[PDB]
Symmetry: C2
Subunit: 378 residues, 2 copies
Amino acid sequence: HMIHFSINKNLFLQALNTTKRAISSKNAIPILSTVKIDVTNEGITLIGSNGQISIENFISQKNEDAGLLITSLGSILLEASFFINVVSSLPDVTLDFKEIEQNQIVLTSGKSEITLKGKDSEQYPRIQEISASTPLILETKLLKKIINETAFAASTQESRPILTGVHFVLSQHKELKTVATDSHRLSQKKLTLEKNSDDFDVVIPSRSLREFSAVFTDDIETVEIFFANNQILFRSENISFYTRLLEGNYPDTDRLIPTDFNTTITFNVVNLRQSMERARLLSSATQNGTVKLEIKDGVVSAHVHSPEVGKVNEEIDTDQVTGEDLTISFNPTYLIDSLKALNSEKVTISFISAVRPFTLVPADTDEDFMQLITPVRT
Amino acid sequence: MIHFSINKNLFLQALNTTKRAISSKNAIPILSTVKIDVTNEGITLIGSNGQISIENFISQKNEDAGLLITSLGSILLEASFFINVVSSLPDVTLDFKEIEQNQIVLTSGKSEITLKGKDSEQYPRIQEISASTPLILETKLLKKIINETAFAASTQESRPILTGVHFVLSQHKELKTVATDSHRLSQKKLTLEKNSDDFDVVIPSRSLREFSAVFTDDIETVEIFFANNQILFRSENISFYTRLLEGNYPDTDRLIPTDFNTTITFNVVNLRQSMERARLLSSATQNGTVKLEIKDGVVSAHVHSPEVGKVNEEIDTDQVTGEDLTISFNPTYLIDSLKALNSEKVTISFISAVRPFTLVPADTDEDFMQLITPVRT
């Protein structure tokens, strides 16, 4: 059984590019740099993986846009980057894909014939199948929104794996909590699901979640989620996206969130971001790298002193300041991250002291979106 | 000490132009800074990297700058950082005040940012070119030359004269510009509508690439002045100096073959795209070439990369004449030559599989000529 099919170059190229999102250049298992191409009666399946995530992108014969004509079945491996570059370089709207002697594929497109050396696919590792379960269905724009609101807060230190993921908890059949922290700052988003589902408690690598947002384009309105202990699957009509879960107990984060406050300030999000980025230009010349907010009698100001380099003294305009005076220093990158995560015009930040973590929420909104930032003692 | 106020965006635009001549790493460390001279007339921004120098003048009388100068002087600031800070400031105007210890307080709205600078006495002077009458060329004429030739120059530092472009004015109106790296060559000849004094110079191709980015299209002309070791392109407000390469540029006229045995006229974009397919596979080889096979009126391209793949393409042709031929060459040289053409078709002319071939744009008045040396296979 040797492969032979033809297809529309662009729809093919798109599917390859989606699949490539799970394929690294250098992998510790050499063969995982290849894309795997299974060709059956029903259609073509593109498989890619890197040991953390795997993508199965299927193009069905019956898809009108594919212009997919299948003559012979079979399987093959090609080095993904190269193959993808070559297809992309072909001149015509459709192309011929014909396997021949010794794992070679001839690509005919117009008057241009290009033969690439592939590999037998038996050596490619089969993907472990999540057991037939009841799916959880979420609107994808909701997931992408959770991801943008939380994944940046997760650690990037691989020596503490559990905090490199996002913690997802469904309780009471409809209460969804998502939290991420790197021990310095924290992000938490809570929803109520419109429909009830069976409870779960998982930790999903943040890198996997960033790929989820890239793999599932907005054309796909919902996705089905299946849970195992080791892994989890997101599936649309044509795409299956598996990722590993992080084993271990996620820390109890609820205790971390304060309830009573001495000072609050309500800021324009954009203006504050621009103030913190200015602050950061000078504070990043230092290792300490902190901005100092001074709040005296309704006036709020930012100060950075980077010896040898310069000094920032800026008054920041505010919608509202309540409570008592406060002087507090923090890493401005965390504040910026927090701000970039908001979709609201305004932000309410609430404080306790110069040494206790402070909270930030979007102002004037139903959203249960809560963040924390630990200040720096000085 | 310095004190002026100015529109931030015009200041920023002027600093980003000057930056073109400032590198972050330098043998002479002080050259990573921009020098700001402030006089009654205006502000002069100076940068230089040892090869090129830019002086950019903003006049107080410039209506767009909103420049008000109340105290004079001069200072150095580390260019990249300073430019980033100015760029980040919130208000449309900027107050620039020098204080104690070569510090500059930048005030923009409610934001005040102080930067440590350096005394400017240590910055090296730009060498004035000797008094002379200018040569005036349309900026778009020069840009066009630069895109047509600077890429053919070498990047190997071992024959430094080949890393520049050779410019020769002869008979007071006959301009030849040529570049080569010994493997491929580019030549553009022109006649100036007005006479000028003869010259013969070699201008580093990196300096030419910066020329094209310093003088935006709103500068229609520039005045050019010559010394033996440097050259000045000057517009109303910008002086751009570059060093010249000294030495004898090779006799390039002796390299252009006269009579041919085979010619072929191609659509330019079509050919480029076949060559780019040919280069995906050939770049996997060491000395990756493409073989052009011409038998009857049929032209075809071939590449074989033993453990990777192969290309077999029939290239559509507009016209084929003369003897059959099989010739091999670096596809990148062909691609570079095609990218440099501004015409729909190209005419390529061969002698044999081992002698260089020429490319000219087809059906045009332009005296624009390229050579590529094939490889024996």
